[PDB]
Amino acid sequence: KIVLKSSDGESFEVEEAVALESQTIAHMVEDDCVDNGVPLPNVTSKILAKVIEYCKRHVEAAASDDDLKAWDADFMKIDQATLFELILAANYLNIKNLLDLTCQTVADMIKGKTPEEIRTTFNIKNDFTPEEEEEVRRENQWAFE
């Protein structure tokens, strides 16, 4: 049992093999700061909660796939701002399943869309001068890839 202290003074009681999904929390039981609980003040407590939920479930692949892509897909039914905070968080800790999952989830939103549809569904202002856009478009279609 390990204690994780969120970025707003919020202790979290979590199991051994759950907190170890994060190689950032694992490489921190060598020089064990665990004496005062692992201080990770970059994760919102709301987010850290969601991170632990994910790790909890995946470690329960002890009893050994089909129902996971189901829980995973349902776990990602969240809003953008929260998706992004998960990515940042998976990177901050070191959860390849999750960073590889949040990042992939954002990437899945881009895949197949056109440049307009992309900045539509992310609210991004097209700041290209028309010459720049044209050059990039020509490069992409006449020359590279």
């Binding site: 701002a81 992004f84 905070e85 881009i110 869309k113 478009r137 992409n140 020359a143 590279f144």
Partner: protein, 566 residues
């Protein structure tokens, strides 16, 4: 802590977008995404080296890990393009020296590569060069090969398939044998090497634990016995020479093939040596009988033993009979290529013709087919119809009808092409090469009308008049590269169809109603559009493509660049 934006996370996510067409879009959403794509793009392919300067490439994508350049037009693979036409790799290797400091893999395809340019590549990239592919290239010698294998000590994959170079010695192979440990794939499949030692090859196998694929020239297979025992992890082997002599009736029969070999093709293999494959035929997923000396009967008997075959390449000797066999034993077949055989003294035998019979058989049996390319001796509208009805998810279909036969069952193929294009709606590449009567202006328009996903097309002897080219031209929403030979169309019609085609960026045409005037092609002069003529020294060729670079500096004398009023 404020609301986290995509911007706080896009540097990270971009590296999970892998598809070249999604990178394309991403790069266009705004200046920042453009920059992140620019700094993280790992692989770039240039379909035509002359399309941009190397400076432009390395400015856009400074951190390439992997590059692939093509030079000469596909036509060059059929001795239609002058040897000196172009495709010089050298400005690209100097740019790699100075500005693509991250490059670990280079694939040159149909280019001129000299010893100087590969000595430069070797020294500049050294231990970082993990893969080099000289793919149908020319212009170098064994000194060049020696140079890269002594300076690039960690090469994982080294390829020379179908390249022409001067062979002065065998020390390149020996140099690999003596120091290389990391080789995974080694490929000199379609090449004349007379001075390399099978001992060296054997010693490479002994030293390269990850050696998975090797393709080779005319080595006596018997000389490779040691090689095969040592190549424990070998999965692919093509080449060698099976030379039977009546003296040893069982010359072979005692081959130890690596236990994993599942992708193979033994050159010159006859019916008497064929059986050495039976012991593990169940395991074979790829077969290359392209250079095999076996008859239509023998094909059926081997094909029959390979239930898990997903790729087969062969000559037309396979026959209708062979296709019928393939039709129900190999249900998993994904790719089939039927090259054309010895077409002078009878079709190799009196079954070595494929026809409506085989095609329609095939269509019904191998419904998983994604790639089908076939030199056929006779077709019927019915066979095209069945292709279209049964094998959806065909991605690449090519049909050429041989000129041997006098009478072709039913010729105008309009209604067949039409149902083919309608049923195989995943089709991205399409080649259709006939004889004059083959397709009418109505059918030509059908091809343009029903091929929304086709990026490349080679059209054979299609149409009857300019009407057809023009009708065709109002379609093909996504046609990027168009190759036509043996068509009647006039200069102004070619010009006008190029204008109508929304996506066209490459045009190669041989045979067309010319005019010494020249000045009719001009009615397609756009900015950035380079038109090159290879004069009638074979009938005049037209090569035209978009380029950000302007007219190539390096044209031969046989190639005339067309510019405004002479």
């Amino acid at each position: 802590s404020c609301v986290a934006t995509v911007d706080d996370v896009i540097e990270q996510v971009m590296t999970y977008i892998t598809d070249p067409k999604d990178r394309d879009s991403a790069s266009l959403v705004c200046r920042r995404w453009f920059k992140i794509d620019s700094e993280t793009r790992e692989h770039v392919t240039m379909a035509l080296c002359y399309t941009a300067t190397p400076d432009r490439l390395s400015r856009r994508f400074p951190n390439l890990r992997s590059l692939k350049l093509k030079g000469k037009p596909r036509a060059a693979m059929f001795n239609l393009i002058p040897e000196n036409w172009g495709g010089y790799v050298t400005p690209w290797v100097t740019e790699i020296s100075n500005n693509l400091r991250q490059l670990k893999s280079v694939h040159f395809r149909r280019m001129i590569v000299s010893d100087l340019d590969l000595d430069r590549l070797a020294k500049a990239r050294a231990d970082d060069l993990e893969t080099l592919k000289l793919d149908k290239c020319s212009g170098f010698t064994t000194d060049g090969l020696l140079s890269i294998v002594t300076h690039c000590r960690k090469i994982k994959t080294l390829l020379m398939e179908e390249s022409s170079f001067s062979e002065k010695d065998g020390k390149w192979l020996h140099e690999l044998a003596q120091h290389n440990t990391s080789l995974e794939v080694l490929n000199f499949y379609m090449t004349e090497f007379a001075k390399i030692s099978p001992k060296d090859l054997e010693t490479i196998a002994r030293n390269c634990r990850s050696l998975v694929s090797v393709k080779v020239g005319d080595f006596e297979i018997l000389e490779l016995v040691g090689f095969f025992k040592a190549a424990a992890n070998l999965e692919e082997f093509c080449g060698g020479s099976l030379n039977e002599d009546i003296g040893m009736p069982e010359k072979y029969m005692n081959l130890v093939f690596p236990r994993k070999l599942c992708r193979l093709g033994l050159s010159y293999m006859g019916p008497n040596e064929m059986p050495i494959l039976f012991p593990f035929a169940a395991q074979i997923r790829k077969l290359d009988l392209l250079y095999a000396l076996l008859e239509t009967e023998d094909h059926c008997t081997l094909i029959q033993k390979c239930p898990n075959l997903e790729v087969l390449e062969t000559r037309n000797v396979i026959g209708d009979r062979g296709l019928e066999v393939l039709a129900q034993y190999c249900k998993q077949l994904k790719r089939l290529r039927i090259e054309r055989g010895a077409d002078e003294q009878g079709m190799e035998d009196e079954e070595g013709l494929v026809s409506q019979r085989g095609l329609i058989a095939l269509a019904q049996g191998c419904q998983e087919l994604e790639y089908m390319a076939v030199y056929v001796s006779d077709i019927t509208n019915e066979s095209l119809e069945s292709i279209g009805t049964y094998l959806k998810n065909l991605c690449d279909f090519r049909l050429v009808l041989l000129d041997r036969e006098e009478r072709i069952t039913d010729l105008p193929l309009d209604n067949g092409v039409r149902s083919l294009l309608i049923g195989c709606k995943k089709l991205r590449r399409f080649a259709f090469y006939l004889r004059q009567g083959g397709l009418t202006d109505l059918g030509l328009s059908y091809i343009g009308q029903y091929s929304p996903n086709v990026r490349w097309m080679l059209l054979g002897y299609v149409g009857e008049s300019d009407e057809g080219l023009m009708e065709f031209s109002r379609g093909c929403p996504n046609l990027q590269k168009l190759e036509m030979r043996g068509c009647c169309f006039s200069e102004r019609a070619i010009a006008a169809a190029v204008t109508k085609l929304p996506s066209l960026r490459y045009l190669w045409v041989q045979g067309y109603r010319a005019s010494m005037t020249g000045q009719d092609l001009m009615q397609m002069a756009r900015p950035y559009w380079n038109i090159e003529l290879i004069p009638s020294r074979h009938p005049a060729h037209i090569l035209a493509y978009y380029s950000l670079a302007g007219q190539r500096t390096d044209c031969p004398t046989t190639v005339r660049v067309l510019k405004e009023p002479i």
